[PDB]
């Protein structure tokens, strides 16, 4: 089969800036019959299946905005995007048909810079109804916020956790840049109840201090 | 407008098969060629072979030939993909996707090329473990999920087996500000997942907040009403 390589595999770039993808086959995918490259690029935006961008190296598929433009020739290729927009996040991928089996790249995330943004932390006791069944869960919730880096750190009667937490971080968001991301704390009921102070504290670039949110089991 | 519109997400046991199905709507496959393309995780893409609905001649990749079928219907413009012999590498998500052909006469025949339409995609998870159900926890607005004129509610999507689940507000009414976060994987072996939005804080008192959870493999469906803390 043609290996498909991309480099990078991430980036990140600003905003109506140009980034540059690059896409190289392990032997020629040039077509002598048309000499065209046999070489396409796709975009996968969160959520979504992928969309065809670029044919033949270098040739847009109808519709597809000005600022993806496709070029290279032989083993070597590359995808620009200039001006770049918030729509734009997504894996990139090439793939190859000059040489049976079609084959892919292994795939460029790309993200979008932006300047900083604090995130809103909230918190959620266990549901009464979850208790009654021998586990307690906790939720903290960090929205909207930029750069993807934050510790959030769980306290239990003011005791940090360690080892049964679990974080999940979404998609950048192509509406303002972000990421929003839960920490779900889990204890058995019997630990739950030994302890009344709960509380999710956060660090990130965006504020000045760390925010604690906190609750006391059994107090409104 | 072209649309490919897959059958539902599938877990089945190894060994066993799966046909999963893929109709154009708005749409009829033409002289367009029908492939079958998947993403296992941490792998790439992989095309598995395809299909010319109007010659009726289908291709496959080397490493899928003797385990794989494509057929497609034209009187129902409806293409399929049945994949033998299942194996836990077999789990991903399998596209059809459409796209043009050019013709080589060098060899004397049409070729595979691009995809210009690709379907939503089918999860097959190939597991010994048996399909469950979530359970819908509330994640309930309060003193403590408040900014200003803000507040955030949810719902926690607990233990359930295999990906994936769906999940809607106010039966799709409600879409902005929702963030619907990726399932982790529990030491149980069941996943777990949270979706929150944020709503103006003055709701809370007079509009009524469900999340509606859909769990194709389990065959479940769970709406969960979310209201908010009181000191009640």
């Known amino acids: 089969d043609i290996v498909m390589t991309q480099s990078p595999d991430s980036l990140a770039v600003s905003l109506g800036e140009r980034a540059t993808i690059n896409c190289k086959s392990s032997?020629?995918?040039?077509?002598?019959?048309?000499?065209?490259?046999?070489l396409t690029w796709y975009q996968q935006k969160p959520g979504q299946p992928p969309k065809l961008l670029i044919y033949w190296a270098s040739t847009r598929e109808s519709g597809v905005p000005d600022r993806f433009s496709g070029s290279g020739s032989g083993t070597d290729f590359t995808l620009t995007i200039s001006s770049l927009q918030a729509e734009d996040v997504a894996v990139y991928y090439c793939?190859?048909?000059?040489?049976?089996?079609?084959?892919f790249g292994q795939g460029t995330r790309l993200e979008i810079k932006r300047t900083v943004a604090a995130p809103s932390v909230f918190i959620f006791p266990p549901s009464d109804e979850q208790l009654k069944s021998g586990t307690a869960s906790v939720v903290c919730l960090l929205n909207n916020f930029y750069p993807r880096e934050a510790k959030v750190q769980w306290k239990v009667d003011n005791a940090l956790q360690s080892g049964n937490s679990q974080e999940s971080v979404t998609e950048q968001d192509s509406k303002d840049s972000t990421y929003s991301l839960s920490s779900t704390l889990t204890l058995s009921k019997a630990d739950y109840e030994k302890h009344k102070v709960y509380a999710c504290e956060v660090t990130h670039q965006g504020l000045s201090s760390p925010v604690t949110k906190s609750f006391n089991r059994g107090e409104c | 407008q072209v649309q490919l519109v897959q059958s539902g997400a599938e877990v089945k046991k190894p060994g066993s098969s799966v046909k999963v199905s893929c109709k154009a709507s708005?749409?009829?496959?033409?002289?367009?060629?029908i492939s079958w393309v998947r993403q296992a995780p941490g792998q790439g893409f992989e095309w598995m072979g395809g299909?010319?609905?109007?010659?009726?001649?289908?291709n496959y990749a080397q490493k899928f030939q003797g385990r794989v079928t494509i057929t497609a219907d034209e009187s129902t413009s409806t293409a399929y993909m049945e994949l033998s012999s299942l194996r836990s590498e077999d789990t991903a998500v399998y596209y059809c996707?459409?796209?043009?052909?050019?013709?080589?006469?060098?060899?004397?025949?049409?070729?595979?090329?691009?995809?210009?339409?690709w379907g939503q995609g089918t999860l097959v998870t190939v597991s010994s473990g048996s399909a469950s159900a979530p359970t819908l926890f509330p994640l309930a607005p309060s003193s403590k999920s408040t900014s200003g004129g803000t507040a955030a509610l949810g719902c926690l999507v607990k233990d359930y087996f295999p990906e994936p689940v769906t999940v809607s507000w106010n039966s799709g009414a409600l879409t902005s500000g929702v963030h619907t976060f990726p399932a982790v994987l529990q030491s149980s072996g069941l996943y777990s997942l949270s979706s929150v939005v944020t709503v103006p804080s003055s709701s809370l008192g007079t509009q009524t907040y469900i999340c509606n959870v859909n769990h194709k493999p389990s065959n479940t469906k769970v709406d969960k009403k979310v209201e908010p803390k009181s000191c009640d």
């Open positions: 793939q190859q048909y000059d040489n049976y089996p079609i084959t």
């Open positions: 708005g749409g009829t496959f033409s002289n367009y060629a």
């Open positions: 299909i010319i609905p109007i010659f009726g001649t289908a």
């Open positions: 996707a459409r796209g043009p052909e050019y013709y080589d006469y060098v060899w004397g025949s049409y070729r595979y090329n691009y995809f210009d339409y």
């Open positions: 032997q020629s995918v040039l077509y002598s019959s048309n000499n065209k490259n046999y």
